[PDB]
Amino acid sequence: MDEKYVNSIWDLLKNAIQEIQRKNNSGLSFEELYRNAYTMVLHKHGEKLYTGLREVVTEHLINKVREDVLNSLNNNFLQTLNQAWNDHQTAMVMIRDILMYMDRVYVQQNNVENVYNLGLIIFRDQVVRYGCIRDHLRQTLLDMIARERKGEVVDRGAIRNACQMLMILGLEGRSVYEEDFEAPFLEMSAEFFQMESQKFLAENSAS
Amino acid sequence: RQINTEYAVSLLEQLKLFYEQQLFTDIVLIVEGTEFPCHKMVLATCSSYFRAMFMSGLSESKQTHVHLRNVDAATLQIIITYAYTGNLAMNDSTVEQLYETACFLQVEDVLQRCREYLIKKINAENCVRLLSFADLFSCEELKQSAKRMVEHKFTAVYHQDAFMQLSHDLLIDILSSDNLNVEKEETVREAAMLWLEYNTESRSQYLSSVLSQIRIDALSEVTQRAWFQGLPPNDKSVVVQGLYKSMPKFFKPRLGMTKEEMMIFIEASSENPCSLYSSVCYSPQAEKVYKLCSPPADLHKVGTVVTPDNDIYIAGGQVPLKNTFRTVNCFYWFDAQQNTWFPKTPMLFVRIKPSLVCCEGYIYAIGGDSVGGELNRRTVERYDTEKDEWTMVSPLPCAWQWSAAVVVHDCIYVMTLNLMYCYFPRSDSWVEMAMRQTSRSFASAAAFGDKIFYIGGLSVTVEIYDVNKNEWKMAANIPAKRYSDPCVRAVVISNSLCVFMRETHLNERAKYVTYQYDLELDRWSLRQHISERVLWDLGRDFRCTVGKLYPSCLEESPWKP
Amino acid sequence: QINTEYAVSLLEQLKLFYEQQLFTDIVLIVEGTEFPCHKMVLATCSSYFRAMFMSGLSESKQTHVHLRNVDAATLQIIITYAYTGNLAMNDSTVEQLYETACFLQVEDVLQRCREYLIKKINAENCVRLLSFADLFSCEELKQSAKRMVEHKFTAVYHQDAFMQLSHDLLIDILSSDNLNVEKEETVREAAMLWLEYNTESRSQYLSSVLSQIRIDALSEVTQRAWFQGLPPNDKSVVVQGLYKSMPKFFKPRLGMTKEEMMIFIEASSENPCSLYSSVCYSPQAEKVYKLCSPPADLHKVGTVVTPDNDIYIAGGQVPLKQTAFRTVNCFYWFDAQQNTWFPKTPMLFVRIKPSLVCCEGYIYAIGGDSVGGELNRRTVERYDTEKDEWTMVSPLPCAWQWSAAVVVHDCIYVMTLNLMYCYFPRSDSWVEMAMRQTSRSFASAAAFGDKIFYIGGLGSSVTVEIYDVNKNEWKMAANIPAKRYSDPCVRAVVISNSLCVFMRETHLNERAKYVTYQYDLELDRWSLRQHISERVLWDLGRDFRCTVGKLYPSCLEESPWKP
């Protein structure tokens, strides 16, 4: 139909998506949203819907979670990161349901990644691989693992949650997580074990 | 492990019974006031969208009554019953709405079933309609199949009412494609024009786009004057943009112009012993021998027929049982561009070497060892090229073997040893015709003009029959070397009666040569001698038929001179 | 057509005139030797004399021409060929023959000597022939020299003529992707020794020769050695090569792509169009690569793989132009890269299923159902890989049929149903060996180390009789555990420095199954090394042969066939 109708449909869909992302999904009309997506993709305007979804998701991420992580980089930084990841996943569940009904045509014909993969990629680009968040996360994980190796006990399930989050963020396998985690961790372990062996060869014997 | 013997059938039947009795239901679908009580588990396992609808953390998940709109009641009911029993039982009319409702709910299994049903039912008329649907409801298989069917048939019709209402992208894809089955370049031009005359001043930019698409070869004929007659007033830059489409954009020849009249042969001497027989072609003008892919690749003893629209069909045949020759009633059709064979509706009786005759757009299979043990051994069965079904007709008067049948003046004529019967399609009855004075079998006849030319039999018997005169007469004897067994083949070539015969002697090689025959001269003038450097031996059970093919799609048969 | 009788009469009369010196008007003066001849014959044969006489120069009317830079014998043979059409070509004067043919621009003799040299190309004259083809234009000779030089020289790299080669020729040789080397370091040291042949005559080419070798050896050793041989105070080469090896990223060559594979011949033709075909199994790649068909579908042939990893075909029969087969003594050589069979010097007698065995560089074909059948129906003959000729050897004392032969301890060991004779290629004599206690035939034997392993015999069975050369005795080891009520097809071969067996078994009302076993030499037991899945390998037949060799997967192509 006319551009005004599709523009209004997209505007209301964007408002509903933003409301869902704001932890206010209690009154989400699934039937209405599914019908608007049907009448939107039916008229061969999937490119505009995909671009708008990407723009809305990246704007929401940069506005909310990029500020939240940087505001709490020292007070439960990893806990806040895990909470933000869980919230993003639980919103992207329904987001991916609707836009995966859409994706059955977009991911296939347009030959692009699915909306779940799109959300994972944009999260990786805007939060984990940020110019400041990445180095801070690396430094804090190295510090806590070194302190654990020193002898004192720290939280361990949290590190498992972070590693699982990075593995899921890989989205294809162990390409991003392996590098980002192991390589600084590999260097830290190398230096730590070299120093430990140097101390042990002089402070003890072969017995 | 999924044990299918006890639990699966019992569980499915008990779920269906619970659905019937309205037991253990917790969700009810409201469809324009109609209530459909059902279960969430079956909807989740069948539909991908219904799963999320009753799971996504929202108000719809905890909602006993859900008001689902934009769905038909009958389609939702049939989807629910298919989910509860596994049987679809789809008709031929409600396929479009069923596919639309299945696409909205993303029910993959029924979506695939409907896709297969639609791709199998692009017969003659819904091609453009289902192509528009293949676009709207994303379906690549359907899109490609409908595109090929359109390129094959719309290029001969180009007047369908549904074709007018098409989106710009689909029309551009259709017109810009090099698969247009048109022997002339003006028909596509006038088709585009009439597509741009009923809707003008609304699609003027798309008018310019289609004008560029049709390209200079048809742009330089009349389009300028017609547009001047039909242009909106006070339009100047449109003239500038229209004048630009004269020089550029790579004027190239099309593909539909290559409809060379050739000869389709079956059951040839296969160089590869793997195949017992092969199907090849000969070019009267290009003097080349082309090859074709075997339809079943293992079954032989098939019959050929060519419709006036230049279509190739294969019916019946026998295939070896391959235990560690059984007869199959399968049907096939030859693709003029893909060089493959798409099967069609099979026959009802397993015939051996059926004789297929086309008349009034219907394919008539006459004789050919139906079942052999019939109470009425002399029967026939025809085909519907539009409805895609087999309809029983009036049976044969007398039972005959090794017979031939042709069509003349929209009437069915079947020839046997000495008798001939004319079948009236309008009244579905057989009328007695003239009887030949010579008893000859193992021969075929050709329908050239208004005269039937029964050639050969056991020889060189030339018995000419005329429908308007209803009499049999002799003309002459074909000049052939003695101490030989000629294999005669009569067929129409370029609106001129000609023959294709091969002579074989003792300790001698076969020779292929076609002669030009004249009606008033009663002589077979030497038209062309087929050189053995291009064509090799064919055999004894080979068949010949006239048809137009594409050289680019087909491949030349490699053989050492 | 032109009357051949008058043509030959005219030619013989002209040759009589030449011998008798009647109508000679022009005399060729070469190093004081008189060559009375005619102008018509010279013009018809050579393309230089037609421009020497019918040109209008000072030699048009002069009756004495001093032809310089030529040889008397070469000119005489060229003249006698022009006068009678007989070209006697030996193995020594072909070089000067080609030189004088190029100088005189005679197409017929040029083509004849080009064919003779294309037949004569071998290992010991490969570099010389390549240099000759670089000096005088000869694309065909240049390409054949390129291939043969690459293979044999990268195998040998010790020819004295290799030092005296042009820079462009060496650049073409080294930078080519057809070199056959097990490692990339032998070419490096060959280039180093060629460069060190001179000191300042190779400095300018040093920057170019290193530009064709991979940088994997352009930063390791053999860079300070060049600095040792550097001219004094030369600061334009050390710092040059210091910062030069940025480009030319290391790319693996083609010679390092040889794998131990089982070559099969006369396999069951996948499609029924052909009679038989040749395939190969990959013990490492676990695939079946197709092989070129035998020359003119040469069936009933024998295979041999020299220690230099070369494949040869001898004997066989071709269907004469329903049963129809004629036996031909044609010989062929397989190109490991071009995937084609190059014809070679044929044998003297035709053979059916010959036993080709290599020893001391000679190819020995023992028996093979010879055509003669005289009192010496057991005559064997060796082949010279250096002179490209066949030489008869001491005949086998006893006539044997369906026999196999192997080479152990620089000696030929031919085995029959129960007897064995060892041939010494030096004294050219046969010595009686140990006698087997079982009468078995239609089997194959593999030479592993200093022991002979006669596997199978009669279908075949799982009987194994191990023979020791040092001990001279036949002893049993074990029987191969196979499924009962079957007919295994045993094939003895040596692979991975171990004795493995290629045994195809067929059960009742079942298809053939392919599986290989590794025989434990010390434990006397056949262990399952690998099981050949039927999804890649189909039926091969019964009269197929197997041999141990190396082939390049890149040059060959995978056979498209359904599992």
Side-chain angles (χ1 to χ4, degrees), chain A residues 1-25 27 36-103 111-207, chain B residues 2-47 52 57 61-134 140-269 273 278-480 486-561, chain C residues 1-56 58-101 106-136 138-268 272 276-373 378-482 487-563:
Chain A
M1 298 292 104
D2 54 77
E3 59 179 0
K4 302 299 297 300
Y5 177 79
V6 295
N7 282 19
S8 61
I9 290 299
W10 157 241
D11 204 334
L12 80 90
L13 182 58
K14 168 185 177 180
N15 178 269
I17 288 180
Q18 287 185 349
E19 193 73 20
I20 287 180
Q21 292 174 349
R22 287 178 181 179
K23 297 294 297 181
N24 199 16
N25 47 15
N36 288 24
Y38 176 90
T39 193
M40 193 72 246
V41 189
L42 179 59
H43 298 353
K44 302 302 178 181
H45 292 288
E47 183 266 349
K48 177 182 179 180
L49 178 60
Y50 188 85
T51 304
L53 158 74
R54 173 181 294 182
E55 193 271 342
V56 166
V57 166
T58 188
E59 186 72 20
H60 168 60
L61 285 180
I62 295 180
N63 285 134
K64 183 60 179 180
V65 300
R66 176 172 289 180
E67 187 71 22
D68 206 334
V69 169
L70 291 180
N71 192 27
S72 61
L73 89 176
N74 57 331
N75 297 17
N76 303 20
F77 162 79
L78 85 88
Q79 199 275 338
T80 46
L81 179 60
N82 187 25
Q83 180 68 24
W85 160 262
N86 294 331
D87 189 11
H88 180 74
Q89 207 280 331
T90 195
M92 287 267 147
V93 163
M94 302 158 295
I95 290 179
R96 183 259 308 269
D97 293 330
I98 303 178
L99 285 135
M100 176 267 304
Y101 154 70
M102 171 260 194
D103 261 348
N111 191 21
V112 294
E113 73 282 347
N114 54 82
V115 296
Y116 189 81
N117 288 18
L118 172 66
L120 262 294
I121 285 179
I122 194 63
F123 183 82
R124 177 187 61 183
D125 196 15
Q126 301 296 330
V127 182
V128 174
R129 284 188 169 183
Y130 190 71
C132 183
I133 307 180
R134 179 178 59 181
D135 56 74
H136 179 58
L137 171 62
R138 168 194 304 179
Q139 290 292 147
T140 189
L141 72 89
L142 287 184
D143 204 333
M144 59 192 50
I145 196 60
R147 290 186 295 104
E148 171 68 25
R149 283 187 171 184
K150 282 180 180 180
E152 61 100 359
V153 51
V154 298
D155 53 84
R156 299 179 65 256
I159 300 302
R160 181 181 60 180
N161 296 329
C163 94
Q164 183 69 22
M165 170 188 61
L166 293 180
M167 174 62 64
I168 297 300
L169 193 76
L171 193 67
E172 274 77 27
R174 48 175 307 176
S175 183
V176 181
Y177 156 72
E178 177 181 356
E179 184 265 341
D180 270 325
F181 180 78
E182 298 288 341
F185 180 78
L186 253 49
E187 295 181 1
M188 200 277 304
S189 59
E191 262 75 349
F192 176 79
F193 275 95
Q194 181 177 0
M195 296 303 178
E196 208 74 18
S197 60
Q198 189 70 20
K199 186 255 184 61
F200 287 169
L201 56 86
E203 291 291 337
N204 293 272
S205 61
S207 179
Chain B
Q2 307 325 305
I3 166 65
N4 44 38
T5 295
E6 272 46 84
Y7 206 85
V9 286
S10 62
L11 170 80
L12 195 35
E13 286 163 308
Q14 289 268 270
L15 278 206
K16 144 154 286 188
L17 282 149
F18 281 179
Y19 171 60
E20 284 158 21
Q21 303 142 356
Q22 199 248 350
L23 257 54
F24 304 95
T25 197
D26 52 76
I27 183 62
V28 47
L29 307 175
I30 284 87
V31 198
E32 57 263 355
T34 316
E35 309 291 333
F36 295 94
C38 53
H39 305 73
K40 289 182 180 180
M41 211 177 189
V42 283
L43 294 188
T45 179
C46 205
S47 175
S61 37
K62 194 72 220 72
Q63 218 177 86
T64 80
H65 309 291
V66 285
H67 301 262
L68 182 59
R69 291 172 296 273
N70 295 115
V71 282
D72 203 333
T75 60
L76 188 48
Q77 171 65 26
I78 203 69
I79 287 179
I80 287 179
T81 199
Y82 163 78
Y84 270 103
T85 206
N87 303 120
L88 183 52
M90 59 192 310
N91 49 14
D92 203 14
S93 61
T94 66
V95 286
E96 307 286 74
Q97 194 68 23
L98 177 56
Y99 192 93
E100 185 267 345
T101 46
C103 168
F104 175 60
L105 300 161
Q106 283 298 316
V107 213
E108 218 28 73
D109 48 2
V110 72
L111 266 173
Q112 204 272 349
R113 207 83 71 259
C114 296
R115 156 158 39 94
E116 296 299 86
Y117 189 86
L118 262 59
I119 208 164
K120 197 56 188 62
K121 191 43 62 211
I122 321 177
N123 42 18
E125 56 273 346
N126 45 13
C127 60
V128 58
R129 186 176 61 91
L130 78 97
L131 176 57
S132 203
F133 192 50
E140 257 318 289
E141 274 194 23
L142 210 49
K143 181 136 159 323
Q144 292 321 117
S145 55
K147 162 133 180 174
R148 292 184 267 127
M149 300 318 185
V150 155
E151 294 295 278
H152 174 238
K153 315 175 295 202
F154 146 86
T155 54
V157 197
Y158 41 89
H159 273 305
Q160 315 105 319
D161 50 70
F163 178 81
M164 321 304 298
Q165 316 300 340
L166 284 186
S167 52
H168 190 222
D169 51 356
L170 181 60
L171 180 78
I172 286 302
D173 209 336
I174 288 175
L175 209 151
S176 59
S177 180
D178 52 354
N179 309 330
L180 299 174
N181 197 331
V182 278
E183 63 272 15
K184 53 180 60 180
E185 45 84 23
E186 51 258 75
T187 171
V188 285
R189 182 259 306 176
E190 56 90 20
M193 289 296 105
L194 63 91
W195 193 89
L196 290 160
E197 303 275 42
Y198 89 108
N199 243 315
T200 305
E201 286 89 50
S202 39
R203 309 201 279 234
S204 147
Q205 319 82 20
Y206 318 95
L207 207 165
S208 307
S209 178
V210 165
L211 208 74
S212 78
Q213 212 54 281
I214 201 80
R215 101 175 81 178
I216 75 171
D217 73 323
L219 268 200
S220 307
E221 284 198 33
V222 85
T223 59
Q224 311 101 303
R225 291 87 202 169
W227 172 51
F228 295 153
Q229 151 86 34
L231 48 80
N234 301 270
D235 290 2
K236 308 303 178 181
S237 299
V238 201
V239 186
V240 182
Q241 67 91 15
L243 187 62
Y244 184 59
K245 284 130 188 224
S246 64
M247 271 74 67
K249 74 196 170 305
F250 37 83
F251 157 72
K252 298 185 307 303
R254 284 276 170 78
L255 180 60
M257 289 56 177
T258 60
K259 299 297 309 302
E260 290 83 14
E261 185 82 294
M262 294 181 179
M263 291 304 162
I264 287 91
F265 299 98
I266 60 176
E267 287 188 338
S269 61
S278 298
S279 300
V280 293
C281 167
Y282 176 79
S283 66
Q285 190 267 347
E287 301 179 0
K288 298 181 180 180
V289 177
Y290 299 87
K291 86 166 71 63
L292 291 88
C293 179
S294 183
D298 53 331
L299 170 133
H300 308 277
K301 297 300 181 300
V302 299
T304 57
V305 63
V306 170
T307 64
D309 299 70
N310 301 94
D311 298 71
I312 304 179
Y313 300 91
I314 285 299
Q318 60 175 13
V319 75
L321 286 85
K322 302 175 298 300
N323 181 269
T324 70
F325 288 86
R326 64 162 67 98
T327 315
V328 181
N329 52 336
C330 54
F331 196 87
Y332 292 98
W333 170 83
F334 177 72
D335 200 323
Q337 182 182 353
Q338 298 292 148
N339 196 17
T340 181
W341 293 80
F342 291 99
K344 294 296 180 180
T345 300
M347 286 181 36
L348 278 77
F349 302 94
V350 279
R351 291 191 184 270
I352 287 288
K353 284 290 300 179
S355 61
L356 286 80
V357 180
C358 178
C359 179
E360 184 78 340
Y362 296 98
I363 301 298
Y364 301 85
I366 287 91
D369 305 68
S370 178
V371 86
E374 282 166 339
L375 202 163
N376 164 7
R377 232 292 307 174
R378 45 228 171 280
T379 51
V380 279
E381 176 173 337
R382 77 167 186 176
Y383 183 74
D384 199 331
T385 58
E386 188 266 348
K387 203 63 63 180
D388 193 9
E389 48 88 20
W390 308 89
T391 301
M392 302 301 300
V393 290
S394 180
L396 304 156
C398 179
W400 300 321
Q401 53 275 356
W402 286 284
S403 175
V406 293
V407 69
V408 176
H409 197 269
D410 306 1
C411 297
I412 298 296
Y413 292 95
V414 48
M415 196 60 216
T416 187
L417 186 74
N418 48 14
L419 199 45
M420 184 177 57
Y421 267 95
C422 176
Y423 191 64
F424 209 174
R426 265 62 59 181
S427 64
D428 299 330
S429 297
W430 307 80
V431 60
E432 179 79 300
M433 308 306 298
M435 179 104 67
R436 285 206 296 103
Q437 74 283 348
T438 314
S439 61
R440 293 299 178 268
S441 180
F442 297 87
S444 60
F448 171 76
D450 203 69
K451 294 179 179 299
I452 303 180
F453 303 92
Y454 184 83
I455 311 300
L458 178 59
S459 55
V460 289
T461 53
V462 183
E463 322 199 42
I464 304 181
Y465 177 84
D466 201 333
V467 174
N468 301 330
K469 301 301 179 300
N470 191 19
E471 41 81 26
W472 293 89
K473 73 171 185 178
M474 303 291 298
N477 55 90
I478 316 110
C487 182
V488 305
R489 292 293 191 274
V491 75
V492 185
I493 291 155
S494 301
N495 200 21
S496 180
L497 178 62
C498 297
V499 291
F500 182 83
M501 304 179 183
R502 167 189 55 90
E503 54 272 3
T504 301
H505 300 69
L506 41 78
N507 203 21
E508 296 290 337
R509 311 298 95 178
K511 179 59 181 60
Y512 295 90
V513 51
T514 171
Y515 300 91
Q516 188 271 339
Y517 175 75
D518 205 335
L519 180 60
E520 73 279 351
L521 294 186
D522 291 356
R523 188 178 59 90
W524 298 260
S525 59
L526 177 60
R527 180 174 180 176
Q528 194 272 341
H529 47 68
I530 288 91
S531 179
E532 303 293 333
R533 301 179 181 179
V534 289
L535 181 58
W536 85 112
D537 182 71
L538 269 68
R540 295 294 183 178
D541 51 354
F542 65 97
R543 298 299 181 179
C544 177
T545 179
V546 52
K548 300 177 180 180
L549 298 174
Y550 289 84
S552 61
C553 81
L554 300 181
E555 59 277 353
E556 195 81 22
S557 181
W559 182 253
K560 184 256 179 180
Chain C
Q1 286 79 12
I2 288 94
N3 196 16
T4 57
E5 276 67 59
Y6 189 58
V8 303
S9 164
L10 164 53
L11 181 74
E12 61 86 25
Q13 274 270 330
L14 294 207
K15 104 172 282 310
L16 278 194
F17 283 166
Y18 171 55
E19 293 156 333
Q20 286 147 357
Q21 296 85 31
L22 271 63
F23 277 57
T24 72
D25 71 320
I26 181 62
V27 277
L28 308 176
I29 308 299
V30 170
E31 58 182 350
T33 310
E34 306 287 332
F35 290 99
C37 54
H38 298 69
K39 297 185 177 182
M40 306 168 59
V41 184
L42 291 185
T44 45
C45 71
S46 177
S47 180
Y48 158 75
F49 290 130
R50 61 171 61 254
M52 187 75 171
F53 301 146
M54 207 270 303
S55 60
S58 58
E59 304 82 351
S60 298
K61 88 295 204 192
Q62 185 177 0
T63 61
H64 286 72
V65 284
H66 295 263
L67 184 60
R68 215 176 306 271
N69 302 23
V70 283
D71 202 332
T74 64
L75 184 64
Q76 175 67 25
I77 193 69
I78 287 179
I79 288 179
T80 199
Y81 168 79
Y83 271 100
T84 203
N86 293 4
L87 208 29
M89 36 178 52
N90 49 16
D91 207 8
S92 60
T93 64
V94 286
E95 196 91 338
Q96 42 267 36
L97 180 60
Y98 191 100
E99 293 176 0
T100 54
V106 200
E107 212 282 331
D108 41 57
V109 64
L110 264 174
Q111 184 266 351
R112 217 77 73 259
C113 63
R114 175 169 64 254
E115 162 261 342
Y116 185 83
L117 264 60
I118 211 75
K119 229 291 176 183
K120 190 49 199 180
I121 170 66
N122 51 72
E124 60 267 0
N125 56 17
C126 66
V127 51
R128 183 175 60 91
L129 283 182
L130 179 49
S131 180
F132 192 63
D134 209 330
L135 193 66
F136 286 104
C138 221
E139 249 318 295
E140 209 207 345
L141 222 62
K142 192 179 310 271
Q143 273 328 105
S144 84
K146 200 36 200 313
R147 285 158 212 123
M148 180 83 160
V149 158
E150 273 276 77
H151 262 75
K152 308 295 145 266
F153 179 85
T154 48
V156 170
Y157 39 91
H158 280 322
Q159 262 290 9
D160 67 293
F162 173 71
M163 327 308 297
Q164 40 202 290
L165 286 181
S166 59
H167 173 244
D168 52 75
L169 188 58
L170 186 53
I171 290 301
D172 185 63
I173 289 174
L174 196 143
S175 59
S176 177
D177 205 69
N178 308 328
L179 76 168
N180 167 259
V181 280
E182 61 271 4
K183 60 184 62 179
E184 42 81 22
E185 304 284 356
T186 169
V187 57
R188 171 258 300 176
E189 55 90 16
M192 288 300 109
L193 61 90
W194 181 87
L195 288 154
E196 298 275 30
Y197 183 65
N198 304 318
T199 43
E200 91 265 22
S201 285
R202 298 291 159 81
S203 60
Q204 63 275 4
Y205 301 150
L206 188 269
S207 180
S208 300
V209 60
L210 304 181
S211 180
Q212 319 303 138
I213 191 59
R214 279 80 180 91
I215 65 181
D216 72 83
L218 208 51
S219 60
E220 268 62 29
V221 198
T222 68
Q223 275 192 326
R224 266 56 54 182
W226 165 249
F227 297 157
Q228 295 178 180
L230 182 89
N233 66 274
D234 203 332
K235 295 298 132 57
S236 60
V237 187
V238 181
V239 79
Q240 179 186 9
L242 193 140
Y243 51 52
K244 191 186 176 185
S245 64
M246 316 295 132
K248 322 161 296 313
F249 332 105
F250 158 68
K251 300 160 306 310
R253 302 283 192 177
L254 190 137
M256 283 85 71
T257 59
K258 74 212 176 317
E259 291 79 10
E260 193 70 282
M261 299 179 181
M262 301 293 106
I263 289 93
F264 296 95
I265 67 169
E266 299 174 347
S268 65
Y276 305 96
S277 300
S278 299
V279 296
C280 172
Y281 178 79
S282 64
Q284 213 285 328
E286 305 177 2
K287 291 182 179 180
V288 182
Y289 298 92
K290 76 166 66 64
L291 256 61
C292 180
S293 181
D297 54 278
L298 209 60
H299 302 341
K300 260 59 65 180
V301 306
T303 56
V304 63
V305 174
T306 71
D308 306 69
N309 303 86
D310 293 74
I311 306 179
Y312 298 87
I313 287 295
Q317 60 179 7
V318 62
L320 54 98
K321 311 301 295 180
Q322 181 179 0
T323 61
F325 280 102
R326 57 155 54 100
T327 319
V328 188
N329 56 334
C330 51
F331 190 85
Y332 292 88
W333 170 79
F334 183 81
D335 198 319
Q337 185 174 15
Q338 299 293 146
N339 197 20
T340 178
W341 309 84
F342 275 86
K344 294 298 180 180
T345 300
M347 261 197 52
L348 279 76
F349 317 97
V350 306
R351 298 186 187 272
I352 286 293
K353 294 297 299 179
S355 59
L356 277 75
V357 177
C358 172
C359 181
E360 183 72 341
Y362 295 96
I363 302 300
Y364 297 88
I366 290 93
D369 303 69
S370 302
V371 50
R378 347 106 125 86
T379 24
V380 21
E381 165 175 280
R382 71 172 185 176
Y383 170 73
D384 198 336
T385 55
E386 202 257 350
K387 203 61 64 180
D388 196 7
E389 50 90 16
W390 293 81
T391 305
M392 290 289 299
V393 294
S394 179
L396 209 180
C398 183
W400 296 337
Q401 46 274 358
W402 306 294
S403 177
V406 292
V407 54
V408 216
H409 235 143
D410 327 287
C411 296
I412 302 300
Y413 288 86
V414 59
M415 191 63 209
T416 186
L417 174 129
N418 50 11
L419 199 49
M420 187 169 57
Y421 269 93
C422 173
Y423 170 66
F424 190 23
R426 251 73 42 206
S427 63
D428 301 329
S429 300
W430 301 82
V431 53
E432 178 74 291
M433 310 309 296
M435 177 85 67
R436 286 211 295 103
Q437 69 280 353
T438 312
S439 61
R440 294 296 173 264
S441 180
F442 297 92
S444 60
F448 174 76
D450 203 70
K451 287 178 174 295
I452 305 177
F453 304 91
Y454 191 87
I455 313 300
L458 173 57
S460 180
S461 61
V462 294
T463 60
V464 166
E465 315 196 38
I466 298 186
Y467 177 81
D468 199 330
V469 176
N470 301 330
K471 304 302 178 300
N472 192 19
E473 49 87 19
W474 286 90
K475 64 174 184 178
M476 303 286 296
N479 61 90
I480 303 100
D487 44 331
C489 181
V490 304
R491 290 293 188 271
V493 80
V494 177
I495 171 176
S496 301
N497 201 20
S498 179
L499 178 68
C500 298
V501 282
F502 179 80
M503 297 183 176
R504 167 188 52 87
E505 66 279 356
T506 302
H507 308 74
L508 71 97
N509 205 20
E510 299 291 336
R511 312 300 97 179
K513 184 60 182 61
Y514 288 90
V515 58
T516 180
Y517 292 87
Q518 192 271 340
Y519 164 72
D520 204 317
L521 182 59
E522 52 269 0
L523 295 188
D524 303 2
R525 180 182 54 88
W526 283 258
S527 59
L528 176 58
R529 177 183 177 181
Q530 191 269 347
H531 46 66
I532 292 94
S533 179
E534 299 297 325
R535 294 184 177 182
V536 286
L537 187 56
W538 66 103
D539 180 70
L540 262 63
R542 291 294 181 180
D543 52 353
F544 67 100
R545 291 295 184 178
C546 180
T547 179
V548 55
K550 303 178 181 180
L551 291 177
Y552 314 97
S554 60
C555 71
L556 302 182
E557 55 275 353
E558 185 70 27
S559 180
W561 185 245
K562 202 268 179 180

